[PDB]
């Protein structure tokens, strides 16, 4: 890099509520709060629920019952 | 194809207002059989309708379906411009002229042309 034209690149500490700390280098400022990350996020259960939504005859069966 | 052309007759305001309502009648007829109707010219009346409205109708055998409407059309009603409420009798007149396309107006054939070259004066 060059000098005195680039911004700061302080190594700060990350934090999500999940319990997954990985300290990383940027110019956020002081601290890093998160709620989701590469883990503790529905990348693998939210990519399962959006597909299966159809199905209608068993709805009609949930109103006769006999 | 044909030229449907409705001129208003006696009763120059009321039958203008009625020639509006013959033009809407064949207008409603040509749309039924899917024919193109197009108002080529329209002299409007005073209180609605037209003193003459010449409108080309193209389509599929327009002339043989509509050649019988040429003539007068006498209209017994209470008018719109009638403040005493009695019957008035008017008339509209329609013509229907056929398509009749064009051919080349001169035949410039110089074998018909006697060319007479003489001295100038």
């Amino acid at each position: 890099m060059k000098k005195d034209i680039h911004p700061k690149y302080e190594e700060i500490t990350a934090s999500c509520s999940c319990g997954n700390v990985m300290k990383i280098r940027s110019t956020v400022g002081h601290d890093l709060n998160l709620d989701v990350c590469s883990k503790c996020h529905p990348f693998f259960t939210g990519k399962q629920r959006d597909v299966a939504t159809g199905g209608r005859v068993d709805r009609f069966n949930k109103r006769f019952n006999i | 194809n044909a030229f449907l052309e409705v001129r208003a007759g006696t009763g120059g305001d009321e039958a203008a207002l009625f020639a509006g309502d013959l033009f809407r009648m064949y207008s409603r007829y040509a749309e039924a059989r899917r024919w193109r109707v197009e108002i080529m010219s329209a002299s409007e009346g005073e209180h609605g309708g037209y003193k003459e409205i010449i409108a080309k109708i193209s389509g599929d055998g327009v002339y043989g379906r509509l050649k019988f409407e040429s003539g007068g059309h006498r209209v017994q009603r209470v008018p719109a411009t009638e403040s005493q409420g009695r019957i008035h009798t008017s008339a509209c007149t329609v013509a229907v002229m056929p398509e009749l396309p064009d051919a080349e107006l001169p035949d410039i054939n110089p074998a018909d042309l006697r060319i007479d070259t003489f001295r100038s004066s």
Binding site: H6, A14, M22, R25, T27, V28, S38 | -
Partner: protein, 177 residues
Amino acid sequence: AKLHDYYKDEVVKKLMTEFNYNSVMQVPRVEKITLNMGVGEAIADKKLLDNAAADLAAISGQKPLITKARKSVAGFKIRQGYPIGCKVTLRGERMWEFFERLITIAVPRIRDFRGLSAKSFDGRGNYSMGVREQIIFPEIDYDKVDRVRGLDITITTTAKSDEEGRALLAAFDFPFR
């Protein structure tokens, strides 16, 4: 950084087991990342690209170049030499750290998220995606800014074709629906 130190041992070996290279230098390795932001609306608002470049300086690490119209076009009212889009070709250590900060805290914060696509390969082994907003990066307050501004990350890898480059990123557990 840390997934470069995961690269050099487990992703190199992770691909040496898969596409059975008789050499090692035949493994792909990600060359660079070129964050573009083609702001465009510097023709009408000249001081827009000040902050539109100041965004890339805070998203990425370093100071951006502000690039110019190659040949002038009258479809968009730009004369040749007009500053129309700011870019950063980061490489080296900062590319592993921006990529590591990409798949950890930047990818999962995308609103209405499906998973990144896999057809975003150019048929060469180079992945190129586009992001809509700024706020998948924590450096943006969401309160300090006012613009709907977004960029489009271009991952450049030295693979021969994209059958290989999809394996290189998917060995980094890259999303790929």
